[PDB]
Amino acid sequence: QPFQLPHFYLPHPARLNPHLDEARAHSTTWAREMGMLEGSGVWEQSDLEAHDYGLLCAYTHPDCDGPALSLITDWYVWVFFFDDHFLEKYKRSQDRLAGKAHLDRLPLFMPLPEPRNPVEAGLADLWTRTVPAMSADWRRRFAVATEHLLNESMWELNPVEYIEMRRKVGGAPWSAGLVEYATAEVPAAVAGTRPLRVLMETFSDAVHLRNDLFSYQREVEDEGELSNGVLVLETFFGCTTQEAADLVNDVLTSRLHQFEHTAFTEVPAVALEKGLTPLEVAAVGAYTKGLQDWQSGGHEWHMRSSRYM
Numbered sequence: 001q002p003f004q005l006p007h008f009y010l011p012h013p014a015r016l017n018p019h020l021d022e023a024r025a026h027s028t029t030w031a032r033e034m035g036m037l038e039g040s041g042v043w044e045q046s047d048l049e050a051h052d053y054g055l056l057c058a059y060t061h062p063d064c065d066g067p068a069l070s071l072i073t074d075w076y077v078w079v080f081f082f083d084d085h086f087l088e089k090y091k092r093s094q095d096r097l098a099g100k101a102h103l104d105r106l107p108l109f110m111p112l113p114e115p116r117n118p119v120e121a122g123l124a125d126l127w128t129r130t131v132p133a134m135s136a137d138w139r140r141r142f143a144v145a146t147e148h149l150l151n152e153s154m155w156e157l158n159p160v161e162y163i164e165m166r167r168k169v170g171g172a173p174w175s176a177g178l179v180e181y182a183t184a185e186v187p188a189a190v191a192g193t194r195p196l197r198v199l200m201e202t203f204s205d206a207v208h209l210r211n212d213l214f215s216y217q218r219e220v221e222d223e224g225e226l227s228n229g230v231l232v233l234e235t236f237f238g239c240t241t242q243e244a245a246d247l248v249n250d251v252l253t254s255r256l257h258q259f260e261h262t263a264f265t266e267v268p269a270v271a272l273e274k275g276l277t278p279l280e281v282a283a284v285g286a287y288t289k290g291l292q293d294w295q296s297g298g299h300e301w302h303m304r305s306s307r308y309m
Contacts, residue, residue, distance in 0.1 A: 001217070002216050002217055002220075002221060002241055003216070003230075003241045003242045003245045004242065004245075005213075005245075006213070006245050006246050006248075006249035007249065008249065008252075008299065009252070009253040009256050009257075010296070010299065011256070011260065012292050012293075012295075012296045013296065014059055014062075014293075014296040014297045014299065014300035015059075015062040015293065015296070015297070016058055016059060016062060016297075017057075017058035017059070017061060017062045017063075017064065017069055019058065019065065019066035019069050019070075020054060020055065020058040020069075022066050022069075022070065023054040023057060023058055023066070023069045023070050023073045024052070024054035024055075026070040026073070026074075027048075027053065027054050027070065027073040027074055027077050028045065028048060028049065030070075030074050030077070030125075031043070031048055031074075031077050031081070032045070033125075034078075034081075034118050034121050034122040034125065035118040035121065036048070036077070036078075036081045036118045036122065040085070040118055041088065041089070042081065042084050042085045042088050042089075042118075043081060043084065048077065050309055051080065051306075051309070052305050053073055053076045053077050053080065054073050055301055055304075055305055056076060056297070056298070056301040056305075056306075057069055057072045057073040057076055058073075058297075059296075059297030059298065059300050059301045060175070060179075060293065060294040060297035060298050060301070061178075061179065061182040061290070061293065061294070061297070062293055062297065063182070063183065063289075063290075063293070064182045064183070068133075068181070068182065071126070071129055071130060071181075072178050072181070072182060074122070074125075074126055074129075075126055075130070075178055076178075077122075078119070078122040078123060078126055079149065079171070079174070081118065081119065081122065082119050082122075082150065082153075083153065085117070085118070085119055086099060086102070086153050087153075090102065091153075091156060094156070096156060096157070099153075099154070099156075100154070102117075102119075103150055103151055103153070103154060105120065106119070106120065106123060106147070106150055107143070107147050107150075109123045109124045109127055110123065110127050110139075110143045110146065111127075112136065112139055112140055112143060130181070133181065134181060134185065135185065137185070137188065138177070138180065138181070138185050141177060142174070142177040142178075142181075145173045145174045145177050146174060146177075148168070148169060148173075148174075149169075149170075149171055149174050152169045158232070158236065159229075159232055159233055159236055162227070162229065162232045163205055163208070163209070163229070163251075166204075166205075166208045166227075167201060167204045167205055167208070170204055170207070170208045172200075172203060172204035172207045172208060173200060173204060175207070175294060176200065176203065176204075176291065176294070179287070179290040179291060179294050180287050180290065182290055183283075183286040183287055183289065183290040184282070184283035184284075184286040184287050184290075185283065185287070186283070186284060186287050187276060187280040187283060187284065189274045189275075189276050189280070190267075190270055190271055190274055190276060190284060193270045193274065194270070195262050195266040195267045195269070195270045196267065196270075198258065198262045198266075199259065199262055199263055199267060199288070199291070202255045202256070202258045202259035202262065203259055203291050203294075203295070205251075205252075205255045206252055206255045206256050206259060206295060207294075207295060207298060208229070209229050209248050209249075209251060209252045209255070210252060210295075210298065210299060210302065211302075212228045212229035212230055212248060213229065213230060213245060213248055213249065213252070214302045214306065214307055215228065216228055216230050216231070216241075216245075217307075229244075229248045229251075230244045230245050230248050231244070233247050233248055256295070259291075259295075260292075263288045263291070263292070264288070267284060267288060268281070268284075268285070271284050
């Protein structure tokens with residue numbers, strides 16, 4: 001182990017989704033149907049089964065029913081398979097043009113075309129299944145977030161800078177889109193207000209920092225990935241790895257506190273200040289609870305599963 005895991009701030013206990021096993025079998029079968037499994041040159045069945053993204057989605061989205069959980073699970077399986085496939089067929093072979101054309105072809109499967117690869121097929125099926133359940137606004141926003149996350153893999157060619165950039169280019173807003181699918185979508189009235197932006201900011205920072213704390217083994221040391229919270233703080237402040245871990249954890253705790261504060265106090269305040277109807281207020285609250293649940297279940301999935309892989 002690179003460092004001893006710091007003391008985590010965990011105000012809300014993680015809850016597990018009762019439909020888990022169903023999501024596991026369905027995600028495996030679906031991943032096979034997309035051609036992401038053996039024969040792809042990227043994943044085998046054992047790899048996907050070892051990753052266990054079904055547990056991640058069941059932990060992060062406890063209140064959604066079985067099929068929705070299955071959909072979210074297929075989304076996560078797809079994006080992780082996207083990362084691996086891009087780091088295999090393109091990044092490894094160092095072909096920029098092919099990957100660029102790929103990243104150009106991907107948004108075409110999310111209209112607001114015939115797949116040449118398992119990624120495009122998966123994205124197509126996922127869009128087909130997901131779209132009827134959400135509005136046009138969510139479609140646009142989630143398409144934008146998705147395209148952001150995908151185009152962030154184009155990189156082949158300072159702590160505050162790192163956190164702020166990862167805030168925009170991370171996978172947290174994407175996951176939050178899937179969250180507002182899991183519970184309720186955020187009304188356009190309070191969508192642009194400061195408390196919601198701070199909500200998204202703190203959430204993103206927290207998730208990303210935690211992920212950095214748990215990925216230091218397989219990314220910094222083993223892979224050689226230069227982007228990590230712990231690594232950045234370590235090189236910047238000249239601190240030892242453990243000290244950097246403790247600092248990142250402290251910042252994480254602070255972001256969680258600001259998260260809770262703005263969520264359970266300021267957000268309903270700006271919800272009432274914008275004259276939002278109670279029906280939409282319930283949606284905002286459900287969204288907040290969805291974020292909290294996602295954080296909790298995420299940490300729990302990291303602790304109980306991923307760190308042993």
